Design a protein around this motif. Structure first.
Motif, PDB file in Angstrom:
ATOM      1  N   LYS A 101      47.661  39.842  48.750  1.00 51.01           N
ATOM      2  CA  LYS A 101      46.240  39.554  48.691  1.00 51.01           C
ATOM      3  C   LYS A 101      45.412  40.781  48.353  1.00 51.01           C
ATOM      4  O   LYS A 101      44.561  40.735  47.417  1.00 51.01           O
ATOM      5  CB  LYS A 101      45.726  38.951  50.002  1.00 51.01           C
ATOM      6  CG  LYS A 101      44.292  38.404  49.886  1.00 51.01           C
ATOM      7  CD  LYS A 101      43.760  37.662  51.133  1.00 51.01           C
ATOM      8  CE  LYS A 101      42.246  37.390  51.010  1.00 51.01           C
ATOM      9  NZ  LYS A 101      41.851  36.207  51.848  1.00 51.01           N
ATOM     10  N   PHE A 123      43.755  41.965  44.700  1.00 48.10           N
ATOM     11  CA  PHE A 123      42.330  42.283  44.755  1.00 48.10           C
ATOM     12  C   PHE A 123      42.022  43.701  44.243  1.00 48.10           C
ATOM     13  O   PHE A 123      41.051  43.918  43.408  1.00 48.10           O
ATOM     14  CB  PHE A 123      41.780  42.033  46.200  1.00 48.10           C
ATOM     15  CG  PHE A 123      40.422  42.668  46.432  1.00 48.10           C
ATOM     16  CD1 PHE A 123      39.276  42.003  46.117  1.00 48.10           C
ATOM     17  CD2 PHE A 123      40.330  43.911  46.950  1.00 48.10           C
ATOM     18  CE1 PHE A 123      38.017  42.603  46.282  1.00 48.10           C
ATOM     19  CE2 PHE A 123      39.120  44.520  47.126  1.00 48.10           C
ATOM     20  CZ  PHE A 123      37.956  43.860  46.793  1.00 48.10           C
ATOM     21  N   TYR A 162      39.652  44.009  40.966  1.00 49.21           N
ATOM     22  CA  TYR A 162      38.265  44.441  41.287  1.00 49.21           C
ATOM     23  C   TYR A 162      38.004  45.917  41.428  1.00 49.21           C
ATOM     24  O   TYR A 162      36.896  46.402  41.076  1.00 49.21           O
ATOM     25  CB  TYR A 162      37.765  43.704  42.542  1.00 49.21           C
ATOM     26  CG  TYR A 162      37.604  42.221  42.266  1.00 49.21           C
ATOM     27  CD1 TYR A 162      36.538  41.781  41.512  1.00 49.21           C
ATOM     28  CD2 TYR A 162      38.618  41.264  42.580  1.00 49.21           C
ATOM     29  CE1 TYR A 162      36.359  40.433  41.227  1.00 49.21           C
ATOM     30  CE2 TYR A 162      38.457  39.907  42.243  1.00 49.21           C
ATOM     31  CZ  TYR A 162      37.298  39.503  41.602  1.00 49.21           C
ATOM     32  OH  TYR A 162      37.080  38.217  41.230  1.00 49.21           O
ATOM     33  N   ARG A 221      26.516  47.794  42.742  1.00 44.80           N
ATOM     34  CA  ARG A 221      25.953  46.439  42.765  1.00 44.80           C
ATOM     35  C   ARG A 221      26.659  45.429  41.841  1.00 44.80           C
ATOM     36  O   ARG A 221      26.734  44.240  42.133  1.00 44.80           O
ATOM     37  CB  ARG A 221      24.475  46.505  42.397  1.00 44.80           C
ATOM     38  CG  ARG A 221      23.638  45.247  42.491  1.00 44.80           C
ATOM     39  CD  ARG A 221      23.875  44.455  43.728  1.00 44.80           C
ATOM     40  NE  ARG A 221      22.794  43.478  43.973  1.00 44.80           N
ATOM     41  CZ  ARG A 221      22.654  42.318  43.328  1.00 44.80           C
ATOM     42  NH1 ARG A 221      23.499  41.942  42.334  1.00 44.80           N
ATOM     43  NH2 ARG A 221      21.672  41.517  43.690  1.00 44.80           N
ATOM     44  N   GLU A 222      27.069  45.883  40.693  1.00 48.18           N
ATOM     45  CA  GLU A 222      27.943  45.138  39.819  1.00 48.18           C
ATOM     46  C   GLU A 222      29.228  44.716  40.532  1.00 48.18           C
ATOM     47  O   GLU A 222      29.590  43.531  40.503  1.00 48.18           O
ATOM     48  CB  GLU A 222      28.262  45.935  38.546  1.00 48.18           C
ATOM     49  CG  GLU A 222      29.250  45.188  37.633  1.00 48.18           C
ATOM     50  CD  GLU A 222      29.279  45.662  36.179  1.00 48.18           C
ATOM     51  OE1 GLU A 222      28.532  46.606  35.775  1.00 48.18           O
ATOM     52  OE2 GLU A 222      30.034  45.029  35.406  1.00 48.18           O
ATOM     53  N   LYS A 248      28.277  42.152  43.174  1.00 48.76           N
ATOM     54  CA  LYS A 248      28.045  40.870  42.530  1.00 48.76           C
ATOM     55  C   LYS A 248      29.374  40.106  42.313  1.00 48.76           C
ATOM     56  O   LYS A 248      29.490  38.911  42.639  1.00 48.76           O
ATOM     57  CB  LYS A 248      27.318  41.031  41.189  1.00 48.76           C
ATOM     58  CG  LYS A 248      27.413  39.782  40.293  1.00 48.76           C
ATOM     59  CD  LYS A 248      27.308  40.113  38.829  1.00 48.76           C
ATOM     60  CE  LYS A 248      28.613  40.635  38.256  1.00 48.76           C
ATOM     61  NZ  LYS A 248      28.443  41.105  36.852  1.00 48.76           N
ATOM     62  N   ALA A 284      30.539  38.715  45.539  1.00 51.05           N
ATOM     63  CA  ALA A 284      29.719  37.632  46.050  1.00 51.05           C
ATOM     64  C   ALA A 284      30.133  36.340  45.453  1.00 51.05           C
ATOM     65  O   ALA A 284      29.942  35.338  46.063  1.00 51.05           O
ATOM     66  CB  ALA A 284      28.250  37.853  45.686  1.00 51.05           C
ATOM     67  N   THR A 285      30.690  36.335  44.248  1.00 51.27           N
ATOM     68  CA  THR A 285      31.277  35.110  43.735  1.00 51.27           C
ATOM     69  C   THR A 285      32.769  34.935  44.136  1.00 51.27           C
ATOM     70  O   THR A 285      33.271  33.844  44.052  1.00 51.27           O
ATOM     71  CB  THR A 285      31.204  35.014  42.192  1.00 51.27           C
ATOM     72  OG1 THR A 285      31.884  36.108  41.682  1.00 51.27           O
ATOM     73  CG2 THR A 285      29.781  34.999  41.656  1.00 51.27           C
ATOM     74  N   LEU A 286      33.467  36.011  44.487  1.00 48.64           N
ATOM     75  CA  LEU A 286      34.814  35.930  45.057  1.00 48.64           C
ATOM     76  C   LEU A 286      34.895  35.402  46.530  1.00 48.64           C
ATOM     77  O   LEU A 286      35.728  34.575  46.870  1.00 48.64           O
ATOM     78  CB  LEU A 286      35.416  37.337  45.040  1.00 48.64           C
ATOM     79  CG  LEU A 286      36.855  37.527  45.548  1.00 48.64           C
ATOM     80  CD1 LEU A 286      37.789  36.667  44.744  1.00 48.64           C
ATOM     81  CD2 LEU A 286      37.298  38.999  45.641  1.00 48.64           C
ATOM     82  N   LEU A 287      34.062  35.983  47.388  1.00 50.03           N
ATOM     83  CA  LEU A 287      34.106  35.884  48.827  1.00 50.03           C
ATOM     84  C   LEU A 287      32.878  35.119  49.430  1.00 50.03           C
ATOM     85  O   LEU A 287      31.741  35.562  49.296  1.00 50.03           O
ATOM     86  CB  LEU A 287      34.127  37.290  49.373  1.00 50.03           C
ATOM     87  CG  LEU A 287      35.201  38.270  48.905  1.00 50.03           C
ATOM     88  CD1 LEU A 287      34.744  39.707  49.138  1.00 50.03           C
ATOM     89  CD2 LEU A 287      36.507  37.947  49.601  1.00 50.03           C
ATOM     90  N   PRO A 288      33.110  34.035  50.196  1.00 47.66           N
ATOM     91  CA  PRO A 288      31.957  33.267  50.758  1.00 47.66           C
ATOM     92  C   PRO A 288      30.992  34.025  51.684  1.00 47.66           C
ATOM     93  O   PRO A 288      29.811  33.665  51.747  1.00 47.66           O
ATOM     94  CB  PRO A 288      32.622  32.126  51.549  1.00 47.66           C
ATOM     95  CG  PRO A 288      34.047  32.553  51.774  1.00 47.66           C
ATOM     96  CD  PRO A 288      34.417  33.475  50.622  1.00 47.66           C
ATOM     97  N   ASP A 325      27.028  39.071  51.536  1.00 51.25           N
ATOM     98  CA  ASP A 325      25.577  38.879  51.464  1.00 51.25           C
ATOM     99  C   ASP A 325      25.001  40.179  50.928  1.00 51.25           C
ATOM    100  O   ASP A 325      25.305  41.224  51.462  1.00 51.25           O
ATOM    101  CB  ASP A 325      25.081  38.627  52.875  1.00 51.25           C
ATOM    102  CG  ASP A 325      23.639  38.153  52.935  1.00 51.25           C
ATOM    103  OD1 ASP A 325      22.764  38.587  52.152  1.00 51.25           O
ATOM    104  OD2 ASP A 325      23.364  37.382  53.855  1.00 51.25           O
ATOM    105  N   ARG A 355      21.670  40.985  50.604  1.00 49.59           N
ATOM    106  CA  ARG A 355      20.236  41.141  50.821  1.00 49.59           C
ATOM    107  C   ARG A 355      19.880  42.491  51.390  1.00 49.59           C
ATOM    108  O   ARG A 355      18.836  43.054  50.985  1.00 49.59           O
ATOM    109  CB  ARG A 355      19.694  39.992  51.621  1.00 49.59           C
ATOM    110  CG  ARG A 355      19.571  38.733  50.747  1.00 49.59           C
ATOM    111  CD  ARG A 355      19.256  37.462  51.509  1.00 49.59           C
ATOM    112  NE  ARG A 355      20.244  37.103  52.523  1.00 49.59           N
ATOM    113  CZ  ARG A 355      20.231  35.969  53.206  1.00 49.59           C
ATOM    114  NH1 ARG A 355      19.262  35.086  53.002  1.00 49.59           N
ATOM    115  NH2 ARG A 355      21.174  35.710  54.091  1.00 49.59           N
TER     116      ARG A 355
END
Ligand SMILES: O=c1c(-c2ccc(O)cc2)coc2cc(O)cc(O)c12
Ligand SMILES: O=c1c(-c2ccc(O)cc2)coc2cc(O)cc(O)c12
Ligand SMILES: CC(C)=CCSP(=O)(O)OP(=O)(O)O
Ligand SMILES: CC(C)=CCSP(=O)(O)OP(=O)(O)O
Ligand SMILES: CC(C)=CCSP(=O)(O)OP(=O)(O)O
Ligand SMILES: CC(C)=CCSP(=O)(O)OP(=O)(O)O
Lengths: 400, 397, 397, 400
Positions: free
Chosen positions: C44, C48, C52, C117-118, C121, C124-128, C131, C133
């Motif tokens: 895993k 990853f 990434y 930040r890239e 991002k 944020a689409t990989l992992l629920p 966050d 903010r």
């Protein structure tokens, strides 16, 4: 800045720094060349926009102090895989780009001879342009390309600037881009211990177009007869040698097949031998061209090139184009020599503009002090077309 | 489980890729498990499938999203099959696909001419023993320019707008690519006979010029084929429809010539299997009994004649029976019988439950699309084997 | 082994990525093994890391290839560290990096403002549960425009041309991101006091406005810090040098304020640890004994004050001791001793051999760069823990 | 073809078919708009080249018969995330692009409200252009953006064309690209059950620039006083409501902060109320603008918009810009109405060109038969600047 090369920088930016550097060392020059050849503003944008999108990513890293790429090109003095040429004749001047498309693993174990990049660029050109044809590329890639283990062996037997199998040119003509490729025969030669003559013609004779075109077969038969007693019969890499096969990436039935010789020795008796194919050609046209080439050599380290171009449907060999190597000779002298030659040819307008336009092409270097900016000069004479002059520049050496 | 772990670790670049995974990865992992691949190889092949295959598969055709390119590899138009190669000792998993370019099926790429070689290029930098020279040779001889591709699309059904397809054998712990090139587009557009353009492409291979045994094999095959396939330009099955190679050193690569036909009966099985009475040995006749039994126990029919550099003599072909339209539960029962006949008792006993477990979203008793093909072979060296091709998407939706 | 399997299955998009793998993946896999991660989690996290992290790491600095961006995270300029968090029961692996943009360190991106930040991002689409903010909040308050980044690069060493860094905790079977934002560039360029711009950024958080206990905690901390850090604009350590958050629901996220200083002696440990005599309980005093012992047994020093929404009271900080310049074999022996002192006999017994096995290409008795940092903490809830930060590249070259 | 939009197609091609389709349904129109606004050929190339590189990939799939994207935009009638506007005043006309940058997982579980695409495009603009500033974007993304679980809930409470949190505009002015963004307050409102007024101003009051600019604080205080008794005090989504916050992606101290109201009811007494802020503004300029707006509404389904723009360092509120919704009204009528209005304003040159230029913008549709091409008309009056007309087109509806 509102010239096209500047506007495109502003509009497009760069995905990475090497592309930025390539642009800052080439694009102004390329815009200048296109202006100087009387390309409309719309073709200047077409070609600079094409260059940005398709060519900059193909050029790989920008070799510079402190940053030494894994892959070093023999296309230029500094190891940059780029050249820019102009083809000059009576009526017009056209611009051509020469490069090697560098893969992201080029010059390492997974790609020791940069075997994939040029085909990738060609495939992208094939969806861009309706007239691009990959069949001849693929044929020769089949016949002279090498697997990874064979590429690794080749790299043990070649200097670093000769770790290549292919290179690409793109003629910026008639508002279009016309790709042409050149395949080296040396790596297959070295790895297979096969004579270069044998593997060159073995490859040519398997072309589908060769199997259905008696004229091309006849013309090739005439070239072999000329080359057989001049190039080695053994496996050695010694001159004159058949070092490149060139095709146009167009309908096979229209593509010019080129056999390129590399040699170091040239004098007037060798010129005549190559130009007339040892006395095979004797017509007025041929003899008038010979005089031109002789006069050029009087007026004026890399090998000389001799390129025999053959087209399907033509049985008879034409004179080759002859490539004079200019690396190490002063670029001011060469410019003076070219002016003299243009006068000799009666091309008085070219003669009067050559020097000024040259300084304007390379505004960040003093041309009169360099010896690597002019790298080659090709000279040709044609039927249904006249005389031609091809001038190849090491654009990066002209910029840094 | 590895398919779930890789999904968690990798995610998806886009939604089509995600749907592909969700409709095929669980099944693949099951097949790999059932075939006794170690966990490290399950990871190997699934990670490979994620990184290299998923982006090659294009959009996932589904209600309301009609892609520009439609594949004949499956019933729903999806450019994927998973197949198994079964013998008595072992079972091997293989992937069959069409690598879809991003302009495939539009005017800039009417016959999807570029995506397979792009995939093959990525494999050549991934894998040390991948060799592209036979690819490039046959892509030169049967590929077409844009205008010719456009003409071919006007004379061919949507599901036949292709020139090449790729298979990947998950063998030993390696990925072993092979490709097939279709002769039909070039034959249609040039109005050349398929027989002539097939054998012309082959006679121009470097290996052909180098190897006298291969040349001998091929002249027997041309002798056998010349009278049975058309002499003019038409598409009158039986016809020489594909050429297959392995992406390995040209001297090791098998060369495959695939006939397609819509007629097969006992007479023609015998004729194809024996090369018109040329092969009469006990090994051949044992294979023929097999094929006769198979056909008794149970898209064109396929006949694949395979040749190798070094070998002068032809061998029986592989015969392919299409299974589209036949109940998948009946097929399983028939294969259990036939496996019992071969004395593969262990394959007989596990075939049906392992199948249901490959395709848990479906009722195999009510489906007709899941088994798409069956191929059968017999070699003197390796013995009898059977190739079963599944429409994995149809088995998951 | 999983690192080798993934290399075979995935390959590399480019040579820098390959060198990164070859200089770090084997070590990572070893750490993950040593910490008792299951094989499925080793896959895993390594998958990853391949997909990434490798592209986020930029070029691999090496002789003859001097990248445009040079990181202060390691000794060779590489933007990577691997760290372990050790307690008595268990050990957790964590990655620390700077995600390098493709124009980083050039005029179009002088302080590498965009790559983290890239990466975030893509996560944020990989992992629920990722966050962004709090990232976006602090990037708004301490980020700079291009011109300001350019000014900051004229007033800061090469190794400090950054505003943010990212860590990833490989916890439970999840990836848990956190980030730190540096206050120095904005303070330099605006000539604002670090103390003021730090606490201004924090007082503007949504969660601060929502949560009275957090506000109470922070006013104690400002009280403690105001006299000890500069009141004018200068860079006079001790100074509030970073702000850290977790990329989780802002209400759960710890807020961390990191002091950097070049002076630490017994007086100052006591002062930092107890918040100037504010914390006098037995739990605090037990942690102080620990830290005193550690410092006896053995870049600025670090002090990290961590606060949570919900909690009004401050806790002792984490203290960081830099280890650059000290023999790695002496460090190991000292840590074995100190582990014995804590009664972590099992960690004491395996620490040195497991270290050698993490870094087999090096002699730890002759290196001075491999242990880069040590962090030590004590919580009422979780108890004592120790964080060891390795220059993984230095441990592999 | 030798117009810029055609030359760029020829030079650049398309990475995929959706980008091709976007180009074939938008680029001719965009070139026409730039020509019509008197942009030089060099800016026409700059902007079309920029559009190709940066905007086409941001537009996602091209919704068309048989191909239904996962993400449907409310920016246009057909669900396409694109609009093109012109801002017209006495002296000049400038072009603006409006879009939503669609991520590759937009409208699915991993990205239900398309939360990432616009920032990605902005980051790419930040390395392209030296004056682009992300701080205000990030501030508001922090304050009104939502995590994945919250985005999934929002999608249960919103129609499909309103599954968004942000949108981007790009002013093609002065040879530059000036980005602006708009954040919706509705999803946070719905998910948090918080009144829209409260969460809007809570977000604004946390800005760093708000904390150090007494004038902006004062102006905002004046706006709240006007809006508090007009917009809901409860959590409902009912009109008039504070539906968008807008910023310019530039130095925070120079960016205009915008509060956008959405409402369905409008008459002359509501116009005056909005325009004067319930009688707060009474100067000559204000009253002259009011007359203009009234006259426009006489001459002439989506809500009306009222946008209050405030700049740091200005204490007093100016009149808003008023957005008239035009969807469903005949585009021939609108064109006739706009001509009449331009005459009224004394803009006789605009009046005489409007109709012809409109037909020339949309040459593949009969404008006189459509009712969705004109989608909005904004009207503004300024100090140190004059009156303005913003016309928003559904470029795709104008092309298919
Ligand atoms: O550049 C090279 C070199 C070469 C030789 C010495 C160098 O330092 C670099 C390149 C050798 O063969 C060629 C042969 C060619 O036809 C053209 C070339 O440019 C080269
Ligand atoms: O388009 C929409 C819709 C909407 C309503 C009905 C539809 O069929 C499609 C979009 C709703 O809110 C808005 C609110 C706006 O400010 C602007 C808009 O374009 C929209
Ligand atoms: C690769 C080299 C050095 C020369 C060949 S150029 P060339 O193919 O363009 O010849 P032409 O001028 O096109 O005839
Ligand atoms: C139906 C198609 C595309 C091919 C039959 S060839 P095959 O490779 O799948 O069969 P073998 O692997 O050679 O046994
Ligand atoms: C040296 C740096 C960048 C950070 C110290 S914070 P940390 O996260 O590594 O420590 P903890 O994980 O919070 O225990
Ligand atoms: C999002 C909508 C519908 C309108 C706002 S435009 P706008 O921000 O460009 O206003 P301006 O004309 O720039 O003043």
């Amino acid at each position: 800045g509102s010239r096209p090369w500047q506007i495109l920088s502003q509009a497009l930016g760069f995905p990475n720094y090497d592309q930025e550097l390539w642009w800052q060392n080439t694009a102004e020059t390329l815009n200048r060349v296109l202006e100087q050849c009387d390309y409309s503003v719309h073709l200047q944008y077409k070609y600079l926009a094409f260059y940005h999108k398709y060519i900059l990513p193909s050029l790989g890293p920008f070799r510079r102090p402190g940053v030494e790429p894994e892959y070093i090109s023999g296309l230029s003095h500094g190891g940059h895989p780029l050249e820019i040429s102009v083809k000059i004749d009576k009526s017009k001047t056209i611009c051509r780009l020469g490069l090697q498309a560098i893969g992201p693993l080029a010059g390492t174990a997974r790609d020791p001879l940069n075997s994939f990049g040029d085909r990738e660029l060609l495939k992208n050109l094939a969806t861009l342009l309706p007239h691009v044809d990959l069949r001849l590329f693929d044929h020769f890639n089949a016949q002279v390309g090498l697997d990874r283990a064979q590429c690794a062996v080749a790299t043990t037997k070649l200097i670093k600037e000769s770790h290549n199998i292919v290179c690409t040119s793109l003629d910026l003509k008639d508002g279009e881009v016309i790709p042409k490729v050149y395949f080296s025969t040396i790596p297959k030669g070295l790895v297979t211990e096969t004579p270069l003559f044998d593997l060159t013609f073995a490859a040519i004779e398997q072309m589908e177009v060769y199997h259905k075109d008696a004229p091309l077969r006849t013309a090739l038969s005439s070239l072999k007869d000329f080359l057989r007693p001049r190039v080695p019969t053994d496996a050695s890499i010694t001159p004159p040698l058949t070092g490149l096969i060139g095709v146009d990436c167009i309908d096979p039935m229209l593509s010019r097949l080129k056999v390129y010789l590399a040699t170091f020795r040239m004098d007037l008796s060798l010129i005549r031998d190559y130009w007339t194919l040892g006395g095979l050609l004797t017509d007025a046209g041929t003899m008038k061209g010979l005089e031109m080439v002789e006069t050029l050599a009087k007026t004026l380290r890399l090998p000389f090139g001799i390129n025999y171009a053959m087209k399907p449907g033509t049985a008879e060999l034409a004179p080759p184009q002859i490539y004079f190597p200019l690396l190490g000779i002063n670029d001011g002298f060469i410019a003076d020599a070219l002016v003299e030659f243009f006068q000799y040819m009666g091309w008085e307008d070219q003669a009067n503009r050559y020097k000024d336009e040259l300084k304007a092409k390379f505004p960040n270097v003093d041309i009169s002090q360099t010896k690597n900016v002019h790298r080659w000069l090709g000279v040709a004479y044609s039927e249904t077309k006249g005389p031609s002059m091809n001038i190849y520049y090491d654009v990066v050496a002209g910029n840094v």
